[PDB]
């Protein structure tokens, strides 16, 4: 299971 | 033995040809088990291994939404790096991410990963401590400052020590028939004359899983690393892998050469020779 | 800067004339990810070839497996034709039963 990206660059 | 879970993200811009495509694929060891493609007619997280199919609708719904949102985030990131690297809107660019965890035989966390690349080069990576970052350049340092301020690493650590290891453990159990079976290489040596004075010896390994393997030639018991042609380990398409290693030998000296094979599925390393 | 594909053409199982098999073209080590791969039978493109989902290695270089069902014979020649931005001209690698 993978989660959302936490924060953009 | 030890096992890994990995998610591989690729986002590619295509100016003049719509918005950047997003692909996410998931692996346990050398077995792919999920995919998502934003260019699909109806994008959805889809199963790619039999043992993941038992996951319920919530699994597929959640993962699909996660990839849909991730699609947008990478499009934002591609716009951002045009700014950070002072680049034009004309060119195609790529962002990649590798994320996941390794566990040992007892299922305990060995280490976690979260790392990114831009146009095939290191951009920013979570260090093994899961608390600090390595930025490749002054552009990635901008991201690092941003991610430090938001304490992103702490959230990464939480995923890697919890969710990542927990689900890897679950997948390993549900897929134990295959994920926890090593298939040893089937091996043989072929011989092909090149000329009156030289011949090729090729050592084959076929049908093995996982992909990791060591294939070497020795001459009079001495490693022939420099003089060995070693092809990249390649998928057969049936879960298994293939590899060969070839040496050019003086005619009449074939029996001075031995091929050595190491693989997880082999109790002891194999030694083999040309057998006419 | 970019990376040119390594190319391997081969069969899933050892080649056995008159017996059903899979013809594989594995491209790896390339960047960027856009790549054009055809499988050829006697110089002609094989239709409806399938490929693996895009993934990459630890050094960020991409790899893909293209594959199709085929029944090898002694007379039929097979090959892979690859184009990539690093290539001025399409590269053709012929299928060789012991490679």
Author numbering:
A (entry chain C): 1 to 9
B (entry chain A): 1 to 276
C (entry chain B): 1 to 99
From the study:
Our previous work identified NP338 as an immunodominant CD8+ T cell epitope in individuals expressing HLA-B3739. Our conservation analysis of the NP338 viral peptides across vaccine and circulating IAV strains, including pH1N1, H5N1, and H7N9, found 16 natural variants of NP338 peptide, with the most common mutations occurring at position (P) 5, 6, and 7 of the peptide. To understand the molecular basis of cross-reactive TCRαβ recognition, we solved the structure of NP338 and its variants bound to the HLA-B37 molecule, as well as the structure of a cross-reactive TCR in complex with HLA-B37-NP338. Thus our data demonstrate that CD8+ T cell cross-reactivity in the context of NP338 peptide and its variants is favored by similar conformations adopted by the epitopes.
Two major variants; FEDLRVSSF (NP338-L7S) and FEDLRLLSF (NP338-V6L) were dominant in H1N1, pH1N1, H5N1, and H7N9 or H3N2 strains, respectively, representing 93–100% of the distinct strains and were thus selected in addition to the previously published (WT) peptide for further analysis. To understand the molecular basis of HLA-B37-NP338+CD8+ T cell cross-reactivity, we solved the structures of two major NP338 variants, namely, NP338-V6L and NP338-L7S in complex with HLA-B37. Superimposition of the HLA-B37-NP338 binding cleft with either HLA-B37-NP338-V6L or HLA-B37-NP338-L7S revealed a similar conformation of the HLA-binding cleft (r.m.s.d. of 0.08 Å). In addition, the peptides adopted a similar conformation as the NP338 peptide with an r.m.s.d. of 0.12 and 0.09 Å, respectively. The hydrophobic P6-Val residue sits near the α2-helix and interacts with Val152, Gln155, and Asp156 of the HLA. The substitution of P6-Val for P6-Leu in the H3N2 was readily accommodated in the HLA-B37 cleft and did not change either the peptide or HLA conformation. Overall, the two major variants of the NP338 epitope adopted the same conformation as the NP338 epitope and represent molecular mimics of the WT peptide, which might favor T cell cross-reactivity. Interestingly, the EM2 TCR affinity was increased by four-fold for the NP338-V6L (Kd ~ 30 µM) compared to NP338 when bound to HLA-B37. In a similar fashion, an overlay of the HLA-B37-NP338-V6L with the EM2 TCR-HLA-B37-NP338 structures shows that the larger side chain of the P7-Leu might create additional contact with the CDR3β loop and might in turn provide a basis for the improved affinity observed for the EM2 TCR towards the HLA-B37-NP338-V6L (Kd ~ 30 µM).
